Amino acid sequence: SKGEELFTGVVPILVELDGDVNGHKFSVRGEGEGDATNGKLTLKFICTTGKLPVPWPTLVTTLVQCFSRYPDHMKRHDFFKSAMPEGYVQERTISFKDDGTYKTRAEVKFEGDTLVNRIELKGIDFKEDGNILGHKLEYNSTWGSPGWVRLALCLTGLVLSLYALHVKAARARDRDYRALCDVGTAISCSRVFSSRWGRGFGLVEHVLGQDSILNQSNSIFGCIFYTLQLLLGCLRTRWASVLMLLSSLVSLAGSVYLAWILFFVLYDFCIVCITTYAINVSLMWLSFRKVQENSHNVYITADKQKNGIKANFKIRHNVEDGSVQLADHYQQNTPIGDGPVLLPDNHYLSTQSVLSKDPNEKRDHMVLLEFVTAAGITHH
């Protein structure tokens, strides 16, 4: 499109937002530059009216997708650049799960040589004690709390593993030892842990042999597993999530096998064993959900009825208590001018944000670095 030649250089950016959230009114100004060739934008935002009544991360999506890098084979699907320089109107509803809602309207046009994004934001039905009005979101921290849930599952698993190990040693030093989990002649964790399936899952011998250092009491694997689940719960990166998922899968397989042993070989209803199986399914589901929550894509489809596009996506904001806050975005773009625009096939934008602070800025502010690439259409 013709508007493309407006984006091959470095473009200055002005962003102006006036907001009102549960009656707390505020203004934000941002300035910076966009480099669509690299899909890179760098902007600094100031709250001009004082302290921002909402967390900065929640405003990132509102505070210029024409700076996305569309690969050469997808240039015919770049609506945002084709609406320039006249621009487009971008409207959104952002629904925060179990809390309030943002409603936004923006005009994005060229004024002289400046790309200008002017926004009105109205937020309603927010909880004063919630994560938003309560300022409980993490800004950019790379480690933090694991969350009450993960903490309970992992600590419980760790204590039960510790006691299991203690039982195995005590029973090995005394046949008449009766454990806490020795409930009856048919419920004896002592008998379970001291069975050959109590070491290396009764499998490590047949593969790596009996001297292998992997031939540890199953509860040793328990200690390491729950410990790593708990520390990985403290990291805020993709790879920690995948590791949590893989370890959860291994624990799942081992738990299914050990349950089969419990009911069809040992004829034992080991209450502590069933409990660790349940905890392990819980962690399986949590790591599965975590991996799903890792996706940051903007899903774009053409809207012929408005000669523009529509998009929807989910943002997950980290909460200081270790939980996550969902923000369901629904988005509409319509051209301002009357010249031709590109209506794309289905695709998505992949975006990466880096939030930081300016050590020299005394006003409430956000430094933002962003890389955005279009994808979702295979080049073949």
User: Where along the sequence are the contacts to ligand UAJ (CB under 6 A)?
Assistant: 160-161, 164, 192-193, 195, 197-198, 218-219, 221-222, 251, 254-255, 258, 261-262, 266, 272-273, 276, 280
312 is in an annotated binding site: no
299 is in an annotated binding site: no
- As a whole number of angstroms, the distance between CA 297 and CA 23 comes to 31
Report the nearest approach of ligand UAJ to the CB of residue 226 (Å): 9
The candidate with the shortest Cα–Cα distance to 237, out of 137, 306, 142, is 142
Three-class SS state of 291: helix
47 is in an annotated binding site: no
Report the nearest approach of ligand UAJ to the CB of residue 145 (Å): 25
Asked if residues 236 and 144 have their Cβ atoms less than 8 Å apart, the reply is yes
Choice between 58 and 248, CB closer to ligand UAJ: 248
Report the nearest approach of ligand UAJ to the CB of residue 154 (Å): 12
Report the nearest approach of ligand UAJ to the CB of residue 165 (Å): 9
Q: How far is CA 73 from CA 62, 76, 377, in A?
A: 28, 8, 9
Q: Where are the strands (E) in 294-364, listed by range?
A: 297-303, 308-318, 324-335, 347-356
Report the nearest approach of ligand UAJ to the CB of residue 95 (Å): 39
Helix (H) / strand (E) containing 42: strand 40-47
- As a whole number of angstroms, the distance between CA 312 and CA 310 comes to 7
- Residue 47: partners with Cβ closer than 8 Å, 6 or more residues away: 26, 27, 28, 363, 364, 365
Tokens, residue 136:
């409980």
Choice between 127 and 191, CB closer to ligand UAJ: 191
Choice between 134 and 254, CB closer to ligand UAJ: 254
Choice between 286 and 341, CB closer to ligand UAJ: 286
Choice between 90 and 217, CB closer to ligand UAJ: 217
Report the nearest approach of ligand UAJ to the CB of residue 255 (Å): 4
Place of tokens 């993490």: 138
Choice between 121 and 273, CB closer to ligand UAJ: 273
Residues annotated in the binding site for phylloquinone, as ranges? 273, 277
Known binding positions for (S)-warfarin: 218, 277
Q: Give binding residues as ranges.
A: 218, 273, 277
